[PDB]
């Protein structure tokens, strides 16, 4: 793969295919989806680390979007990233106010 050119796992030609037919420019440098799929593979890596560690540490074996909910709501950078974003089948984090 061109990921095997790079030493990575995200599809360079398929993400690059979404660059070519995402209709943003007429001619596109091929160096952009390498860094794109690289950064998305990194962000994917820490968000799946929070996923597997968050659901796995809570005496659970399968990652459920509930644990995506308290996984994101336990994170501040994901709060920065997913602020206007709602998780389906997530509910809420166990967040009860001290007044409650």
């Amino acid at each position: 793969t061109r990921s095997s050119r790079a030493g990575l796992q995200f599809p360079v030609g398929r993400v690059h295919r979404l660059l070519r037919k995402g209709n943003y420019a007429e001619r596109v440098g091929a160096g952009a989806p390498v860094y794109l799929a690289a950064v998305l593979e990194y962000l994917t890596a820490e968000i799946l680390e929070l996923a597997g560690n968050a659901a796995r540490d809570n005496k659970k074996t399968r990652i459920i979007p509930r644990h995506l909910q308290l996984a994101v709501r336990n994170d501040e950078e994901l709060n920065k990233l997913l602020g206007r974003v709602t998780i389906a089948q997530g509910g809420v984090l166990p967040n009860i106010q001290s007044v409650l």
């Binding site: 890596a45 799946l48 680390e49 597997g52 074996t61 399968r62 990652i63 459920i64 979007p65 089948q89």
Partner: peptide, 11 residues
């Protein structure tokens, strides 16, 4: 990354 952890289709 996580060998011993499952996943749903929803997530």
């Amino acid at each position: 990354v996580h060998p011993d952890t499952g996943i749903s289709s929803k997530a």
